[PDB]
Design a binder for these strands. Sequence first.
DNA 1: CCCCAGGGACTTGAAGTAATAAGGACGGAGGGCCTCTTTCAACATCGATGCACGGTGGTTAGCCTTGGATTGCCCTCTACCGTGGCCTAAGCGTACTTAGAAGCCCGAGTGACGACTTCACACGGTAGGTGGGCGCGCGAACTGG
DNA 2: CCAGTTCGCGCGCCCACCTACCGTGTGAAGTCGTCACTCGGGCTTCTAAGTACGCTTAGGCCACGGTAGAGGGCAATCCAAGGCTAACCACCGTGCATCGATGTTGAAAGAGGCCCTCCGTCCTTATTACTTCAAGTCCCTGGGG
Lengths: 78, 78, 95, 95, 93, 93, 107, 107
Amino acid sequence: NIQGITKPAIRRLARRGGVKRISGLIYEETRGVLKVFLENVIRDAVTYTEHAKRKTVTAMDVVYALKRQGRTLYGFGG
Amino acid sequence: NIQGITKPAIRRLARRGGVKRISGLIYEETRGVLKVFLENVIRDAVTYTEHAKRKTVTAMDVVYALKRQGRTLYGFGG
Amino acid sequence: HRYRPGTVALREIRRYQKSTELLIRKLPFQRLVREIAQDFKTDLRFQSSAVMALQEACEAYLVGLFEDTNLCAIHAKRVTIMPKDIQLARRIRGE
Amino acid sequence: HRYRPGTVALREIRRYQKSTELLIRKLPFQRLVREIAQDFKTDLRFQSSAVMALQEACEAYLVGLFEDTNLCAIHAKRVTIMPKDIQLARRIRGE
Amino acid sequence: SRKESYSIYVYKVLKQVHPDTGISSKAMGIMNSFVNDIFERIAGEASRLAHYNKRSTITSREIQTAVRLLLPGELAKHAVSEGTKAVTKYTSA
Amino acid sequence: SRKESYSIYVYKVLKQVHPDTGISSKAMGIMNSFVNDIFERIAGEASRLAHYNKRSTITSREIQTAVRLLLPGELAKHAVSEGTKAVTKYTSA
Amino acid sequence: RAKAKTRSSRAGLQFPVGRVHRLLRKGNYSERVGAGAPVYLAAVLEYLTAEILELAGNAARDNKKTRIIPRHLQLAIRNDEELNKLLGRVTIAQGGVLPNIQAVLLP
Amino acid sequence: RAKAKTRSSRAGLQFPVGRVHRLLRKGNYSERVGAGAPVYLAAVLEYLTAEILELAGNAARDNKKTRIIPRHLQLAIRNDEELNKLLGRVTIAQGGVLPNIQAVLLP
DNA sequence: CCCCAGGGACTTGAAGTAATAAGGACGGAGGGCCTCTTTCAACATCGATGCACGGTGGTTAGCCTTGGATTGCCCTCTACCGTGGCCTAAGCGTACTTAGAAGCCCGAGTGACGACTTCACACGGTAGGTGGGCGCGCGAACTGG
DNA sequence: CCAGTTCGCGCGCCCACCTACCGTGTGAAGTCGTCACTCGGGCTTCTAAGTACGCTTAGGCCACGGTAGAGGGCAATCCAAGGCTAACCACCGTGCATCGATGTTGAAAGAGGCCCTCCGTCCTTATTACTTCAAGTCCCTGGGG
């Protein structure tokens, strides 16, 4: 499923970042980087979920998880 | 007063940073960076002092200024 | 008519920097979330808005990284970002 | 006897990386502290330990910057740090 | 279940500065998060300031001091002015 | 004026792990800052958890989740074990 | 009795003074909250929202649009030196980025 | 009555449970504090202190020293990934840095 | 620079749907009262911050010779670009199934609280241990030949 | 390597002063006991989260020839470091004068807990106009000649 972040998708993200040319090895590095980031955020969001005695991760939980990692998110209710 | 940060002193700091060879333009650059850095910390530490209606900046005041800027300092009472 | 290598690249920057839609396919991202979440707790559900919140953060984070990575590449008098550039960006940020 | 350029420099790194004393002259540094603080409020006094705290943070902070600057410098296949390297390092740190 | 927000207040202020400009539901969500976000910093910072001085009451002084620490440059100057003007009028009802 | 600190407790812990090793007054100060720092983080994070879950009581659950959130990797695992063991013994007096 | 006059109206503010006061008491910030604290706090939030909103509405007019969407807010925050510094570490959902191309990549 | 037995001893801890409880109740963290919270919190804090000290004492021993100084603490903290991550943005006064020379600069 | 052209911006004309204006409700502000206490201000007390002076070297400021670092030219080649072909499934419609999110009700297990008490802790005090200045000879990495 | 040396540095020789152990009072931590009340548990219902399963473009995956950016080699030129000197002032140590950190105490300015009253703000609805997509036109920058 990690391959679902397709090569064209990674290219499009880089273009938004102002990247003009992309080396052929970048795609594998980005996938690895994304894996690390996602694990951290999801870990915290799931941790909050267990504390709330809930079985469904809510957007607010993610927002809280993002705040503690210094990646405050605006737009999902706080 | 900024000239008191002499060339050897700036060099020694760079040596601690693992720098092997240093360009002649670093000394002027470093002074500017330090001044900015110092202004922010002193600004906050002085601000704390004025709120307490005190006339002497204490060690605690400096540590707090550092904490809120993400530079927690250990060894001086917090 | 054939555009010279690089001409189309500048056009994509302008188009994607002008647009705001999410650029990673939704379903692939959703499948990714569920596989990762499985390792922490089984049969974990996610509000549709929860997945959206993750994607917004993830894209913004990656955009931020590619921007910093580019500066590193440009710094080395290159225009191509390479794995060594990403590593540097991450190292400086403290990751 | 004349050591070739670089031999003594590496010797200084090892010596200074093992030691912990403060490397900026104390009096000149204090005057700077007082001079900068003078612009915000007059007749401002400073506890002696307060000046030491500022000095420790500044030296520690500056050393940290030089380490990241070096990584940027190496990235450009150079061994000499230059102002553009500090600028790059600081930009990436978000300052 | 009724869930409090700043929506009504955000809309009033918008109509004062830009009478003909609206706001999308998404943008409203952003504004609520922003107001709460700044609110936490101000309220949270005032607490440490209050705590440092062994005081149990947070007064306008702490808010003023907290504001000076957080708002950068001219933002602080104008924000402090606005609060003081408002509070002054308030004490005279 | 008496100034509270964790010095005695820091010394006790040191004497268990290194009976023949001392610590300087400066190093002792470091530990005090450390203890307070970790305390604040846990206590501050614990407050958010309670507030997020609309519970006015801070209990074992909040600290347990707080530790799982703050402490990285195995530090949390072992710390959580220690806390659980201590509470269990305490509840049985 | 006399007609009830809201604390918000006495201070000439649009933000809810009473709610902020209750929120401070129930926000676990301090044991007590002075009568001047909520008024001052409310005015500051109002001013800042006005500032951000004012700059964002202007950006909207430049784009010939009459309704604010996340895009306009991102422009306002990143295009303003003072507000950008305050909101450095914030991610605006559906905001996109500022048009910025490194000079070395241009033809 | 019976001899006063500290809550720390009842839980087998060296850290002051009684003191931690007072700090929680008066630290503006929550309205109420559960009976296990100060105990639980104190136990975690004690364990973490032990961890650093254990690693620091080892570093001290390696230098033929009998007193831990800030230098030794820096070595212990930076050499442990987990402790380093937890205390990443912390500066130890009089700590110095880890001996580290970039490979490309070596002769 | 030109001709030919390939893409995006601009400008109506139809849909449509989210903004939003308008009405009913309740619980959350607001006025009002009596009440507990936090804190301004007064006055008091002494530590420690500022200032000064005389040395006393250690450490800087500046210069000279230098050879190794920088960098610009050059080739070169091979690692991505852009276009095309071609197939897969993501986006969405529509619908159904149902797990648990969320809520209402309840009590008893829980913590706030007060009164009282006592010994764990911190401040003053004492006396040795650890380690730094002084001083020296041993470990060996480096560099001109 | 040969050969010489500078640096690094470990090992003492004291002294000394930084810290471990000791003596004392107390205030806050411990215990009993009362009582208010929070949230874990039982039960219920509706949402939307998952699921299925079809369609239809639309975009991803592969191939392919090429081209320009990345990269290695070379040389000149140039500029920070090693070594030398004269000299500056950072710091030790002492000493004093005096501000304000710091503490205490009175009482009143302030904020609370509770209570009755009112209306501001939120849920709900219906209606737009501003947005949105499609097409058609026009500007304009781009690349081989």
